A paper describes a structure:
Most SPFH assemblies also abut a cellular membrane, where they are implicated in diverse functions ranging from membrane organization to protein quality control.
The two Erlin paralogs are highly similar (74% identical) and are each predicted to have an N-terminal transmembrane helix followed by tandem [name] and [name] domains, two helices (CC1 and CC2) predicted to form coiled coil interactions, and a C-terminal region (CT) that resides in the ER lumen. The overall architecture of the [name]/2 complex is a domed cage-like structure with a height of ~165 Å extending into the ER lumen. We therefore modeled 13 heterodimeric pairs of [name] and [name] based on the hypothesis that the predominant arrangement of the [name]/2 complex would also follow this pattern. Following the [name] domain, the 101-residue CC1 helices interlock through hydrogen bonding and other electrostatic interactions to produce a sealed wall of 26 helices. The narrow end of the [name]/2 cage forms a 4-layer structure. After β9, the CTs of alternating Erlin subunits extend in opposite directions. One CT (modeled as [name]) forms a short helix and extends towards the outer edge of the cage. The other CT (modeled as [name]) extends a flexible segment towards the inside of the cage, leading to a central channel-like structure with an inner diameter of ~12 Å.
Residue numbers in the entry:
A (entry chain A): 77 to 185
B (entry chain a): 98 to 146
C (entry chain l): 195 to 243
D (entry chain m): 147 to 194
E (entry chain M), F (entry chain L): 186 to 240
Write the structure that this text describes.
């Protein structure tokens, strides 16, 4: 889900993340966060980061205008935390599908 | 020559994650900037490029 | 509840005010065009006389 | 703010237990209020 | 609950006013175009009248 | 019992006083806005009248 600044909810159907960690950081990564570091570090924060990004933008900006930048903003948000907390793991890319909008708004468009 | 490096960096099924997982995102990014008329009629021949 | 219905009513009244102003300006411009036409008609009437 | 409050409470009572992060989902606003929010957005597109 | 409904109803009107303004402006433009049509038709009619009086 | 019911009825009236005062104030504000609208519309109309008289 993503609650836009207009007070309406739009559900982004699929948010994919492509990541990779340097070999030398494997020991430390598994020591710190086990083998589930992906779920511990990326895909649990995804929804909160998306909500934070959406709360400052309207339905138009997220759905149409700033869709070119949703992925870049989310990738930067994830990498900012990962760099400091778990060095070695990097987010090579992020991908997002077009958000779903209510029927009434879709009809007007 | 680059086959060895490509298969090393990414599994044999590289093409999926390298092209066909990004196709939809790139197309959505392209469409977000162009109106329906441009994509459907006018700018259609430029979608490939 | 009344303290907020007050603001709602104020906003609706302001909207009505803006609509009325737009209508008045429309009438003004239409009248300007009509009176230019009247002047032209009067000139032609002078020529006819 | 919630993380700050929890950490401030813990720092003295139970030193050594650090609260790294906090996350929250968006609240569930009532149906009547939610309907108005949708109506607002419907007007933003009626202008177009 | 109603007190909170009024807070959002204020926001709906802020956009409904823009919608009303746009509709009124469209009506104004239509009326102006009609007035110009009438003016040009009158011009043609009056040239015809001048020719009529010469004949 | 009715004697004690009347004692509380006094407080309900005390609150209804403020409620009706707020409603009347809202009506006053609405009427003032309408009067301002009429004034501005009349101003535009009379500028139009001056132009018409010049023509
Ligand atoms: C593991 O945790 C330690 C202690 O917090 C930190 O210094 C180190 O950078 C971490 N390493 C990785 C790979 O997460
Ligand atoms: C594989 O990844 C390395 C990382 O340094 C890069 O330099 C190299 O060009 C890549 N080779 C491929 C993709 O064939
Ligand atoms: C345990 O309680 C004592 C007594 O208040 C306190 O001094 C100490 O810091 C506490 N330690 C932890 C780990 O909570």
């Amino acid at each position: 889900p993503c609650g836009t600044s207009g007070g309406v909810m739009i559900y982004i159907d699929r948010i994919e993340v492509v990541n990779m960690l340097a070999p030398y950081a494997v020991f430390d990564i598994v020591r710190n966060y086990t083998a589930d570091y992906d779920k511990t570090l990326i895909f649990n924060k995804i929804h909160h980061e998306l909500n934070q990004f959406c709360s400052a933008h309207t339905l138009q900006e997220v759905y149409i205008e700033l869709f070119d930048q949703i992925d870049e903003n989310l990738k930067q948000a994830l990498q900012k935390d990962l760099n400091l907390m778990a060095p070695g793991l990097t987010i090579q890319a992020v991908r997002v599908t077009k958000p779903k909008i209510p029927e009434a708004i879709r009809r007007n468009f | 020559n680059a086959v060895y490096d490509i298969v090393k960096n990414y599994t044999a099924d590289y093409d999926k994650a390298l092209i066909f997982n990004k196709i939809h995102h790139e197309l959505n990014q392209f469409c977000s900037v162009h109106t329906l008329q441009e994509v459907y009629i006018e700018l259609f021949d430029q979608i490939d490029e | 509840i009344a303290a907020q219905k007050q603001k709602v009513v104020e906003k609706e009244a302001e909207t009505e005010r803006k609509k009325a102003l737009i209508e008045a300006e429309k009438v003004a411009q239409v009248a300007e065009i009509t009176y230019g036409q009247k002047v032209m008609e009067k000139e032609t009437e002078k020529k006819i006389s | 703010n919630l993380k700050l409050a929890l950490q401030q409470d813990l720092t003295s009572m139970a030193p050594g237990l650090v609260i790294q992060a906090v996350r929250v989902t968006k609240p569930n606003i009532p149906e009547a209020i939610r309907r108005n929010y949708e109506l607002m957005e419907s007007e933003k597109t009626k202008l177009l | 609950e109603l007190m909170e409904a009024e807070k959002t109803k204020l926001l709906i009107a802020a956009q409904k006013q823009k919608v009303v303004e746009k509709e009124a402006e469209t009506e104004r433009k239509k009326a102006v175009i009609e007035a110009e049509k009438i003016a040009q038709v009158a011009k043609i009619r009056f040239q015809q009248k001048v020719m009529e009086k010469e004949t």
